[PDB]
Each structure stands twice: as C-alpha cells, then as structure tokens.
Design a protein around this ligand. Sequence first.
Ligand SMILES: OC[C@@]1(O)OC[C@@H](O)[C@@H](O)[C@@H]1O
Ligand SMILES: OC[C@@]1(O)OC[C@@H](O)[C@@H](O)[C@@H]1O
Ligand SMILES: OC[C@@]1(O)OC[C@@H](O)[C@@H](O)[C@@H]1O
Ligand SMILES: OC[C@@]1(O)OC[C@@H](O)[C@@H](O)[C@@H]1O
Ligand SMILES: [Ca+2]
Ligand SMILES: [Ca+2]
Ligand SMILES: [Ca+2]
Ligand SMILES: [Ca+2]
Ligand SMILES: [Ca+2]
Ligand SMILES: [Ca+2]
Ligand SMILES: [Ca+2]
Ligand SMILES: [Ca+2]
Lengths: 114, 114, 114, 114
Amino acid sequence: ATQGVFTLPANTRFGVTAFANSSGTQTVNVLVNNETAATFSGQSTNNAVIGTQVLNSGSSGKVQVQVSVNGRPSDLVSAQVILTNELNFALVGSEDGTDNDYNDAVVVINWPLG
Amino acid sequence: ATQGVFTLPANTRFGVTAFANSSGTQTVNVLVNNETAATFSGQSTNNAVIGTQVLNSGSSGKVQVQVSVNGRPSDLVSAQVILTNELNFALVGSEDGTDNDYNDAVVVINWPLG
Amino acid sequence: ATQGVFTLPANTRFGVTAFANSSGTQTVNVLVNNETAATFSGQSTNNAVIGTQVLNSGSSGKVQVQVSVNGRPSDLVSAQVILTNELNFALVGSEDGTDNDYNDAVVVINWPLG
Amino acid sequence: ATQGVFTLPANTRFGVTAFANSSGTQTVNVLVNNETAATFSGQSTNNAVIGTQVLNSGSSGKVQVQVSVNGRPSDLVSAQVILTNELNFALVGSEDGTDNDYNDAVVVINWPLG
Ligand SMILES: OC[C@@]1(O)OC[C@@H](O)[C@@H](O)[C@@H]1O
Ligand SMILES: OC[C@@]1(O)OC[C@@H](O)[C@@H](O)[C@@H]1O
Ligand SMILES: OC[C@@]1(O)OC[C@@H](O)[C@@H](O)[C@@H]1O
Ligand SMILES: OC[C@@]1(O)OC[C@@H](O)[C@@H](O)[C@@H]1O
Ligand SMILES: [Ca+2]
Ligand SMILES: [Ca+2]
Ligand SMILES: [Ca+2]
Ligand SMILES: [Ca+2]
Ligand SMILES: [Ca+2]
Ligand SMILES: [Ca+2]
Ligand SMILES: [Ca+2]
Ligand SMILES: [Ca+2]
C-alpha cells in the first residue's frame, strides 16, 4: 500500500521535522499538491534533527513525504493519529538498508500550530 | 485516564523532542523510572523545537512526560503507535488554556535509534 | 481532554462494534450530530460482541461514543488512526472500576465500508 | 514493509475479530508462533462480522494476520495503537482489488481481556 501520503485540512499551517538514524545521508522531500515545498538533508546515527519547517497544506491539502539515500528511494511506513479529535500527527519511518529498523529517516508532521 | 506515561523496552535508547505553540513558556519534564532525565523550556507560537535529546529507558522502561506553564500542570493527551512492528512513536499533546488545540507543548518520543 | 468524540467525513457509512470485558452490564450509546443513533447493551468477561451496526455520519459528521454501567458514565480513552490515508479506525476504551484495564467496554468504529 | 505482524506480551489472552467489505469471499488466517490458531471465512459488503475469537499469544507472543481471496493473498496495511499505556489495538486492513479502499477484510485484535 502507498505510504507517506496524507490529506490535511486545506489551507492549514503544519510542521514537518526529520530525524536521522543511519550511516547514509538522508534526503527528505516534502511535496504539497505534488510540488516540492521543503527538502532536508543530513546524516546522523544519533537521531539528530536534520530539518524542521512550517508549511501550509494549501488548497489541496495533499502532503507527501519522500525519503532517499544517494538518489535511491527508501521503503516507507506511515500512519496518521488524531488525539482528542484535534491534535494530528502524520508519521513516517523509512528503511534504506537491510536491518529493517525503519528509523533511517523519521519524519513527523504535526498540526494545528500556534 | 492517565496520559503521558509509556512503557518502553528496558535499556533502550530513545529520542525525545518538544515543540511549542503557545504564548506561555512551556516547561517539559521527562522522567525515567520516576526520576527526571531531561527538562526543556522554551516559548514559541510557530512550532519551534524547544528541545531534543537522546535518553535511555533504563531498567524499568518507564518514561513519563510532564508539561507545565508557570508551574501549573497542563492537561495531557497521549498515545503510542507502532509501525511495521518495529518503529515506535510515543506522542504527547498538552493544553495550557481554554482553546483546546492541545498543541501548546507537543512532545514526540521515538525509538529505536541508530 | 474530551474522549470518545470523532469527526467523520459527512454523509459516510461507518461501522460501530462493541466488546465487553467486565462483570458489569455495559451500555454503549452512539450519538450522531448529538442525537442517539445506536445503543448496545450486554455483559461479558470474554470479549463478546455486545453489538455491531452500520450507521451514517450524516451532515455534521459528528460521532460520539458514550459508555455507562448501571447509569454511571465510565471513564473513556480514545484515538483515531488512519492507514494508507484511506482506512479509518476510531477507537474507544472505557473503565468502569478501579483496575484500569480500560477494556470494560471496547468500541471500534471503522470506515469506509462496502 | 511487512504488515500484519504483531508482538504481543507473552501468554496473554487477546481477541481477534474480522469484518468483510467486498464482493469476494474473505479468508482470514491468524497465526500464533507461526502456526495457525484461527481461520475466519465469509462474505459481506456491509461490514458483517465474519468471525471473532479469543486466542492466547503463547510463549512467543508472535501474532500474524493473513488475508486472501480465492487463494490470492491481499495487500495488507497495519499498525498497533496503545491507549493510556494499557489498552492495545492491533489493526489490519486489506485490499483484494483495485479500488484501494483497504477494507475488504478488516481485522481488529485487542487486549487485555477480562
Ligand atoms: O548503511 C545504512 C544503515 O545500515 O546504517 C546503520 C543503521 O542505522 C542502519 O539501520 C542503516 O540501514
Ligand atoms: O496564553 C496561552 C494560549 O492561549 O496561547 C495562544 C495559543 O497557542 C493557545 O492555544 C494557548 O492556550
Ligand atoms: O466489577 C467491574 C470489573 O472489576 O469487573 C472485572 C474486570 O473486567 C474489571 O476490569 C472491571 O472494572
Ligand atoms: O471484487 C472485489 C471488490 O471490488 O468488491 C467491491 C468493493 O468492496 C471493493 O473494494 C473490492 O476490492
Ligand atoms: Ca535501517
Ligand atoms: Ca537505522
Ligand atoms: Ca491551547
Ligand atoms: Ca496553542
Ligand atoms: Ca476495568
Ligand atoms: Ca475489564
Ligand atoms: Ca477493495
Ligand atoms: Ca471494499
């Protein structure tokens, strides 16, 4: 099944933050309405934040997270969780190798903000 | 029901990161085996990261997140989500006022690391 | 924080199913747009299904699950999880006593159907 | 990533329930420690319960849900959610065709029981 794709309410500010846990340099791309809106790149094996930014879901509300290492797309796992019917978390994990820890690049999208 | 308390596998490294979305200064305290292990403090209405750190769950695996503003405990909401039976997210939202956006202090705990 | 309240897409068919795990008779009430739409009642300590039904979210999309034992409201815990940005689960747990297993009445709402 | 596999605490009673939403007959197989423990079969396009049963996670705690239609494995989506660090839900969705509603066979595993 497709992973890393989330439908957010339209024209809503949301945060996107990425963490790295791999020897390989992680390239995290965030698309809004199928067009790039943010790109983070970094390397860490200690969960360092390689990027964080505030974006707007726009008219479509479509947000997609892509993760690659040296140009090769990583396998993604994702889900959205909503607490008290208000607080949203769109979560993404990714695997660039063979150990299957799926934390090589971890991306957290949260809203509402402010 | 109690919120903000999570049982992680023993002696496991995990990451904890906090974001702020409120006029009030957020004080996030993380306890491991009922003893403080990390404290983040900051203010932002734009989802700024007020802290991030790598901790160890220790022998008990008990991790508890506390959030307060000017010494008054905020109301918490939380849940744990596991993807592909490997990637874990312990999520916490908090409300310090009356608008109920529960994002005043948002805390994300993730594991495994590395 | 409020629990047991979910905003579903408008005019959408959804399923609601309740399980019981308590000595007390569980009364599960489901409200759509603040008006009762379904009521299940039963007793079991072996997770028996005390009710299942197909409802429509209607114009408001507001769905609220209430659980009580002998007229006393139980304490609720809840969350919504979305898989592959399509499959939705609105989950509710409830505690009628002191052991805090929160399974006395477990309610699962799922959509889409068909 | 692998889906439909969950690690439950050892020797713990859990419930497993399946719903159907497809023209095709759904065959849901539940394995405990890689050995079949339950099999449900049924057809419905109205979310009918095609099976529910109480099982024990056993010594390994390994539980895997498989779904097939006419012998062809369906594509699975899954996740585990824990509320108030006590109530567990292992969720599975499946797609047997091309519309991607992933509800053709929906499986819910919950614990603790009693
Ligand atoms: O070379 C990449 C890789 O093996 O790096 C070490 C660990 O972070 C792994 O999970 C990751 O797949
Ligand atoms: O004064 C605190 C408060 O009102 O600040 C503005 C918003 O972030 C609110 O959600 C928050 O409760
Ligand atoms: O008398 C009610 C109660 O104690 O019944 C036995 C168990 O199911 C408990 O969790 C429940 O709170
Ligand atoms: O023939 C199988 C199928 O098309 O049946 C009707 C709907 O339930 C669909 O989602 C399902 O994939
Ligand atoms: Ca890896
Ligand atoms: Ca890794
Ligand atoms: Ca607030
Ligand atoms: Ca706020
Ligand atoms: Ca109880
Ligand atoms: Ca009980
Ligand atoms: Ca289908
Ligand atoms: Ca279907």
